Amino acid sequence: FHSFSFYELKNVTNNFDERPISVGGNKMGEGGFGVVYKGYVNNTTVAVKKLALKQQFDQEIKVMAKCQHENLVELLGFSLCLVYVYMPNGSLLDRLSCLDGTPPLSWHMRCKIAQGAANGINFLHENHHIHRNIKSANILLDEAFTAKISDFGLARARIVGTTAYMAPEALRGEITPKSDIYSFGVVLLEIITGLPAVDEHREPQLLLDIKEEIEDEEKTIEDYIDKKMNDADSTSVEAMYSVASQCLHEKKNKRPDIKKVQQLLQEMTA
Amino acid sequence: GSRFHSFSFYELKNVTNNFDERPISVGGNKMGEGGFGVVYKGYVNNTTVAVKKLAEELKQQFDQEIKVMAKCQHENLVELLGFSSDGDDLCLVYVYMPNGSLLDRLSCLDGTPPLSWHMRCKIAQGAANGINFLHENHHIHRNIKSANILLDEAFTAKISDFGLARASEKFAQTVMTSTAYMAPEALRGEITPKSDIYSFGVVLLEIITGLPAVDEHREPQLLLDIKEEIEDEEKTIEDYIDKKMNDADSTSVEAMYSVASQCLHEKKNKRPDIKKVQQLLQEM
Ligand SMILES: COc1cc(N2CCOCC2)ccc1NC(=O)c1cccc(-c2ccn[nH]2)n1
Ligand SMILES: COc1cc(N2CCOCC2)ccc1NC(=O)c1cccc(-c2ccn[nH]2)n1
């Protein structure tokens, strides 16, 4: 890694200009733990996450020091700010919602993204880490649309997480990689549907609840498939939905482990 | 709380031997403790009473317990006599429940006899009747646990600890979360009576098994997780029945377990409401 002065990071982000990119500012995204800014270090674009907590900073540095992998975003350095390699296609959330005029993700691309994200999770679990905040806002996309996991402030070798992605045992305070599998199930539903994980104005508010609707025949998988893609065949969509459903089991021991999820996602496109 | 008496802190301090924290068994005044604080043996009008000494939000809980108790009297709810707020700490004074808490009795504290199966059935049915009264009167308890089901001389179940009770439902959920009795939707921030049913399901498992809702040294740590084991046939209901009672017929116990299992559905709309629970417990 490398040290950055706060002076430099202030300068390369137009003094942390919080206006969105689309207004001419530097803000690319925000969450409960900080704001992510576009920075220009000489000829290079970087992503600068400014936190807004110290233990999360230290923890993210720790985990990122220990965990480097092709489906994890690379941390360039630190200042509280964290500096990362810029991911030009932004977050999976932003692409699923077609923000900033981008075209919809194809089904083929969505499948490869699911596989890449699963590969990142597998690396984490092989190395005895739990992410604890898997969600579509934290899956970034490079120029090839390769999926890379970020946001490691909550990672682990005080109950905290993103409510709409949290397994019941995680909500109760258990620490297990099986909770990451559950969260990934919600991401798979986002990939299939193009809908957000929670929407207060929607029935059901939580996306994870469409599993129950489908099982009860109040809705079907077809009712929920993203209408904006045109290369999505029923067999593979139902295969992905099957993986998602399995990941969303209420009981941790009944969920597939990440290697099984990888197998199923491979067989989906095989 | 005009229904109740105001007691001075000085008198309560006096009659509890200056809040003597040693247990009753050695001549002190401490009867138990919880997240609310500590419950002491005291006296008013030459009568033994329970004195809960609580330990901005705390005052809100105090006021809320008083408000709920003012509104709700029933065979299966504890009775508040008065309150103290004039001294160093907030106190709530209740009618004494001589057989202590369901938790005390399930764990056989001080070497008390195990509750018989018939007594357990009476307690389950009575607790359900108390919850029904609350729900009929549009209250959500939010804190149903074996530690706050108290027991009179007839081993009648009396629900206590209304400081977190609510009288309005809410369905919005937290965006970021920043438990052994809590339903998933409650953990997500909803306020609904259906969550009380889930908590009651855990209490029913405690009644059947004699086990605590959570045990760090046990597999599984959470009692609610035994539902999975039984469904997998890795364990049977009989494997879990409290071995310390001897009048428990298998059919009745399995029926109570069925009620508990139904109460513990992960999805609130698939759980029975309290009136259905009452009915099933009567059929049991
Ligand atoms: C929402 O984050 C981004 C959005 C974009 N968009 C911005 C709008 O125009 C298209 C590209 C481009 C890049 C990013 N993010 C990154 O390059 C990046 C790199 C490393 C971590 C993170 C991140 C996002 C949330 N937590 N961590 N983000
Ligand atoms: C744990 O509380 C008690 C324990 C006992 N034990 C204590 C040990 O000796 C035998 C009797 C006897 C009585 C009580 N409690 C009450 O009489 C009482 C009455 C009304 C409310 C409460 C209470 C306790 C916690 N929340 N609410 N407690």
Swiss-Prot record, chain A:
Function: Serine/threonine-protein kinase that plays a critical role in initiating innate immune response against foreign pathogens. Involved in Toll-like receptor (TLR) and IL-1R signaling pathways. Is rapidly recruited by MYD88 to the receptor-signaling complex upon TLR activation to form the Myddosome together with IRAK2. Phosphorylates initially IRAK1, thus stimulating the kinase activity and intensive autophosphorylation of IRAK1. Phosphorylates E3 ubiquitin ligases Pellino proteins (PELI1, PELI2 and PELI3) to promote pellino-mediated polyubiquitination of IRAK1.
Molecular function GO terms recorded: ATP binding; interleukin-1 receptor binding; kinase activity; magnesium ion binding; protein kinase binding; protein serine kinase activity; protein serine/threonine kinase activity
EC number annotated for this UniProt entry: 2.7.11.1
Main subcellular location: cytoplasm
Cell cycle among keywords: no
Subunit structure, as described in the record: Associates with MYD88 and IRAK2 to form a ternary complex called the Myddosome. Once phosphorylated, IRAK4 dissociates from the receptor complex and then associates with the TNF receptor-associated factor 6 (TRAF6), IRAK1, and PELI1; this intermediate complex is required for subsequent NF-kappa-B activation. Direct binding of SMAD6 to PELI1 prevents complex formation and hence negatively regulates IL1R-TLR signaling and eventually NF-kappa-B-mediated gene expression. Interacts with IL1RL1. Interacts (when phosphorylated) with IRAK1. May interact (when phosphorylated) with IRAK3.
Chain sites annotated for binding ATP: 28-36, 49, 135-138, 151
Domain annotation Protein kinase: ranges: 22-265
Keywords attached to this entry: Acetylation, ATP-binding, Cytoplasm, Disease variant, Immunity, Innate immunity, Kinase, Magnesium, Nucleotide-binding, Phosphoprotein, Serine/threonine-protein kinase, Transferase
Membership in a protein family: Belongs to the protein kinase superfamily. TKL Ser/Thr protein kinase family. Pelle subfamily.
Catalytic machinery residues: 133
Biological process, per Gene Ontology: cytokine-mediated signaling pathway; innate immune response; interleukin-1-mediated signaling pathway; interleukin-33-mediated signaling pathway; intracellular signal transduction; JNK cascade; lipopolysaccharide-mediated signaling pathway; MyD88-dependent toll-like receptor signaling pathway
EC category: transferase
Pathological association: Immunodeficiency 67: An autosomal recessive primary immunodeficiency characterized by recurrent, life-threatening systemic and invasive bacterial infections beginning in infancy or early childhood.
Post-translational modification: Phosphorylated.
Catalytically driven reaction(s): L-seryl-[protein] + ATP = O-phospho-L-seryl-[protein] + ADP + H(+); L-threonyl-[protein] + ATP = O-phospho-L-threonyl-[protein] + ADP + H(+)
Name of the protein described by the UniProt record: Interleukin-1 receptor-associated kinase 4
Localization: Cytoplasm
Cofactor entry: Mg(2+)
This protein's GO CC annotations: cell surface; cytoplasm; cytosol; endosome membrane; extracellular space; extrinsic component of plasma membrane; nucleus; plasma membrane
